[PDB]
Design an enzyme around this catalytic site. Structure first.
Site, PDB file in Angstrom:
ATOM      1  N   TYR A   4       0.886  -1.163   0.000  1.00  0.00           N
ATOM      2  CA  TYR A   4       0.000   0.000   0.000  1.00  0.00           C
ATOM      3  C   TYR A   4       0.914   1.199   0.000  1.00  0.00           C
ATOM      4  O   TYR A   4       1.794   1.298   0.817  1.00  0.00           O
ATOM      5  CB  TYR A   4      -0.892   0.045   1.230  1.00  0.00           C
ATOM      6  CG  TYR A   4      -2.364   0.025   0.905  1.00  0.00           C
ATOM      7  CD1 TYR A   4      -2.970   1.085   0.255  1.00  0.00           C
ATOM      8  CD2 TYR A   4      -3.151  -1.070   1.216  1.00  0.00           C
ATOM      9  CE1 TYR A   4      -4.305   1.062  -0.052  1.00  0.00           C
ATOM     10  CE2 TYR A   4      -4.483  -1.095   0.885  1.00  0.00           C
ATOM     11  CZ  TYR A   4      -5.045  -0.019   0.266  1.00  0.00           C
ATOM     12  OH  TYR A   4      -6.340  -0.040  -0.053  1.00  0.00           O
ATOM     13  N   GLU A  41      -0.162   4.803  -0.376  1.00  0.00           N
ATOM     14  CA  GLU A  41      -0.934   6.038  -0.435  1.00  0.00           C
ATOM     15  C   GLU A  41      -0.021   7.245  -0.255  1.00  0.00           C
ATOM     16  O   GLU A  41       0.884   7.246   0.585  1.00  0.00           O
ATOM     17  CB  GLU A  41      -2.031   6.036   0.628  1.00  0.00           C
ATOM     18  CG  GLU A  41      -3.342   5.445   0.132  1.00  0.00           C
ATOM     19  CD  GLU A  41      -4.387   5.328   1.222  1.00  0.00           C
ATOM     20  OE1 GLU A  41      -5.589   5.456   0.909  1.00  0.00           O
ATOM     21  OE2 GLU A  41      -4.009   5.109   2.392  1.00  0.00           O
ATOM     22  N   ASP A  73      -5.791  15.079 -24.765  1.00  0.00           N
ATOM     23  CA  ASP A  73      -5.891  13.658 -24.445  1.00  0.00           C
ATOM     24  C   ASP A  73      -5.236  12.886 -25.589  1.00  0.00           C
ATOM     25  O   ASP A  73      -5.852  12.672 -26.637  1.00  0.00           O
ATOM     26  CB  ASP A  73      -7.354  13.268 -24.251  1.00  0.00           C
ATOM     27  CG  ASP A  73      -7.530  11.853 -23.744  1.00  0.00           C
ATOM     28  OD1 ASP A  73      -6.528  11.113 -23.620  1.00  0.00           O
ATOM     29  OD2 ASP A  73      -8.688  11.481 -23.474  1.00  0.00           O
ATOM     30  N   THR A 129      -3.487   7.323 -21.740  1.00  0.00           N
ATOM     31  CA  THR A 129      -3.343   5.958 -21.268  1.00  0.00           C
ATOM     32  C   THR A 129      -1.898   5.511 -21.448  1.00  0.00           C
ATOM     33  O   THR A 129      -1.135   6.096 -22.222  1.00  0.00           O
ATOM     34  CB  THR A 129      -4.271   5.012 -22.032  1.00  0.00           C
ATOM     35  OG1 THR A 129      -3.918   5.019 -23.422  1.00  0.00           O
ATOM     36  CG2 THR A 129      -5.722   5.443 -21.882  1.00  0.00           C
ATOM     37  N   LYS A 159      -2.306   0.944 -25.513  1.00  0.00           N
ATOM     38  CA  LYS A 159      -2.510   1.339 -26.908  1.00  0.00           C
ATOM     39  C   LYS A 159      -1.163   1.515 -27.611  1.00  0.00           C
ATOM     40  O   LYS A 159      -0.299   0.640 -27.496  1.00  0.00           O
ATOM     41  CB  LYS A 159      -3.390   2.595 -27.006  1.00  0.00           C
ATOM     42  CG  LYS A 159      -4.694   2.467 -26.205  1.00  0.00           C
ATOM     43  CD  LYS A 159      -5.688   3.602 -26.442  1.00  0.00           C
ATOM     44  CE  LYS A 159      -6.750   3.604 -25.338  1.00  0.00           C
ATOM     45  NZ  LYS A 159      -8.000   4.371 -25.630  1.00  0.00           N
ATOM     46  N   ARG A 167      -2.153  -1.651 -18.885  1.00  0.00           N
ATOM     47  CA  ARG A 167      -3.400  -0.901 -18.800  1.00  0.00           C
ATOM     48  C   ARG A 167      -3.338   0.086 -17.639  1.00  0.00           C
ATOM     49  O   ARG A 167      -3.191  -0.317 -16.480  1.00  0.00           O
ATOM     50  CB  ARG A 167      -4.571  -1.864 -18.630  1.00  0.00           C
ATOM     51  CG  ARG A 167      -5.766  -1.559 -19.511  1.00  0.00           C
ATOM     52  CD  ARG A 167      -6.607  -2.804 -19.740  1.00  0.00           C
ATOM     53  NE  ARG A 167      -6.127  -3.577 -20.879  1.00  0.00           N
ATOM     54  CZ  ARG A 167      -6.558  -3.407 -22.124  1.00  0.00           C
ATOM     55  NH1 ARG A 167      -7.481  -2.490 -22.385  1.00  0.00           N
ATOM     56  NH2 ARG A 167      -6.071  -4.149 -23.108  1.00  0.00           N
TER      57      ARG A 167
END
Lengths: 411, 410
Positions: B49, B51, B195, B221, B224, B230
């Protein structure tokens, strides 16, 4: 390692983290160690497939086999928790909560959740979070003397404030939650009920905590933490109409393409949790947490919030020791013990000046720790925290930690 | 070994690997990642974790997670020339969600590309958070040339006076000039957000204009054309916006990041910094142009705008007496994967559209060259021209087996 010679810096870091996890006592309540199969599923070729939509109703072709995988995760989740519908696509617990709000309330609606100092999560109304910026949040706390939920106080605030939605579930509350009582209070004021069981989902799956699925309009959860799955979110419901609103809120509502390789890891983790060994593991989780609570109750300077635990975690006030949560967190790190500072009931939320730390046992339980080993861990925490300016005693704690980690190797 | 416990799951993954092997993947948003990227996603980093941000974490024990995340951040900054990077967004949708929060207030007016002429769902769809939270107006493409008219963008910007202008598309095969969008944004006092998800790999190779020096915030992203895992990413050169971006990701809309995916991002960025990736991206555009040439000269296919400058193309199929959905079904029956797609000024509904979208990044990763990319385009036309004649469709089904057997994947 043939593919690792191209990038020595990256794999050297991963190799050092693997050694760090080996030699460190992980006591953060939200941490765990997943199986080889779960990791192998996340590193599968399923990351290459775009699968917007839902099984049998995809926007792209060629989804016949990713549909089998996602349906395996959906059907195993329904079998695990007894739910009529499941959505395994949320990228995280935060995204699961985001879509659940959209299926239940409107912007500006009143929501009654657990007070953030008493156990509630940031996604339950914090103003630096989407939740506190979008909806009108009122909070119920815990009793000043016992530090447990007062369900009559919940009923009073529900009548006085007329919330459209009541939220139950917590990230720092170590006592049993009566979800059936929350359903009664919601029915009285005509409110909906949403449960965020992320921290206790593994204990719910093993039948060691009351199951919120039959009571909540919508139940949200992470797949990691006590469930010991990959990092991600999930939404459950028994209402057919809400299932469609949930499905529409996740996609095209707030997300795009799902992570089918993570979803394959979710299916692997759900089947692992369906095995009788998982109930034995979850029973040892609670037994280890209760043994540590006994040590902290007896120790001078460490106050256990509410004085007991019914699940996997515990909150500890260290103000009597002349330190705060940050210093205690820094001290235990120097002897290879990892905890996190955490607000405790009735503090005015000061995320850096808090007096509390949070400790949980799911990680060391996966490594094989039993009650007597958990006792030794709690005694080592007390020894380091009481070691006011004492390098010779901090070194003795380091030796004790080393004995435990070598007795219970990870991989 | 570990597969013995759950044979149904691992059997389904074996069939998907087999489906990927013997299928001709022409969906413009797909790709095949390296063995190192998958191994990073399948690493022990999923147990941590983290954060917060490197050097300012909420938990302890992040010494080496901070190294991994800083690797992704610094490699992204080196790749694109950005002064600040955020590598925690779980997806392109979450990257766009956080970008709007750092730029505008709910209800503000935003001018973006029309969803029927290239825009993405996160660019104002009324069933999406974008269209639900903000007031979106659209700019399209010219009815004659089927490309963006930057004077029309200038006209609509002065008319509506938006607080934000969005550039970037999901189904637009021509160069987008980000320098002209900045000028239009400067004229009306609006911010600019780009974008670049579909073209980020081409941008990284220097084969498409880079929006980072021009946009207030750039989103993308990591999969692609970038051929990463991903996920999503946000870039900026403005330090004040970089802090708002960091606050919008966490604790704004996300919680704990996926550091095993972030490790895969750092792996993919190093693969993109290698000269082999530029030659890969050049082959993408060359393969795409070779297919367009076949479609222009074929009877029954009309390339939208008549050419391509990137990885994709839109193909009008109405002259064959066929919908996009009909063409998608024909090609699927012979192991060729495309998707139906609306064409500029679409006459029919999105339930049938009028065209198909085709992209080359996937077959290029399998090793296809121009000669092979010309054969796939010839097989497409032959299947779409065969009016339910199974003798022809059996011949193209034989042809696609020749290609997939010639270029093995796994």
């Amino acid at each position: 390692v043939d593919y690792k010679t191209f990038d020595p810096d990256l794999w050297a870091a991963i190799a050092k983290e693997e050694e760090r996890q080996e030699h460190n006592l992980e006591l953060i309540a939200s941490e765990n160690f997943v199986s080889e199969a779960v990791m192998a599923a996340q590193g599968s070729i399923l990351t290459n497939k775009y699968a917007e939509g839902y099984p049998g109703h995809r926007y792209y072709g060629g989804c016949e086999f990713v549909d089998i995988v996602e349906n395996l995760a959906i059907d195993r989740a329904k079998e695990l928790f007894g739910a009529k519908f499941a959505n395994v696509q949320p990228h995280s617990g935060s995204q699961a909560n985001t879509a659940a709000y959209l299926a239940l309330v409107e912007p500006g609606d009143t929501i009654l959740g657990m007070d953030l100092s008493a156990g509630g999560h940031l996604t339950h109304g914090s103003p630096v979070n989407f939740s506190g910026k979008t909806y009108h949040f009122v909070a119920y706390g815990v009793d000043p003397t016992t530090e447990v939920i007062d369900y009559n106080v919940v009923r009073i605030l529900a009548r006085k404030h007329q919330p459209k939605l009541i939220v139950a579930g917590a990230s720092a509350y170590g006592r049993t939650i009566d979800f059936a009582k929350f359903r009664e209070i919601a029915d009285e004021v005509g409110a909906k009920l949403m449960v965020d069981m992320a921290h206790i989902a593994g204990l719910v799956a093993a039948g060691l905590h009351p199951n919120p699925v039959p009571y909540a309009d919508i139940t949200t959860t992470t797949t990691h933490k006590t469930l010991r799955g990959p990092r991600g979110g999930m939404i459950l419901t028994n209402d057919e109409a809400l299932a469609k609103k949930i499905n529409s809120a996740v996609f095209p509502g707030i997300q795009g393409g799902p992570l089918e390789h993570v979803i394959a890891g979710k299916a692997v983790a759900f089947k692992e949790a369906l095995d009788p060994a998982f109930k034995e593991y979850s029973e040892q989780i609670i037994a280890n947490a209760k043994a540590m609570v006994k040590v902290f109750n007896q120790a001078i300077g460490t106050r256990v919030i509410s004085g007991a635990t019914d699940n996997h975690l515990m909150l500890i006030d260290v103000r009597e020791l002349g330190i705060n949560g940050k210093e205690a967190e820094s001290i235990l790190d120097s002897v290879n013990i990892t905890v996190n500072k955490n607000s405790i009931p009735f503090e005015t939320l000061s995320p850096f000046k808090t007096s509390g730390i949070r400790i949980g046992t799911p990680a060391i339980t996966t490594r094989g720790f039993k009650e007597e080993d958990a006792v030794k861990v709690a005694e080592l925490v007390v020894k380091a925290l009481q070691a006011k300016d004492d390098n010779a005693q901090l070194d003795e704690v380091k030796t004790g930690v080393r004995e435990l980690t070598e007795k219970f190797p990870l991989h």
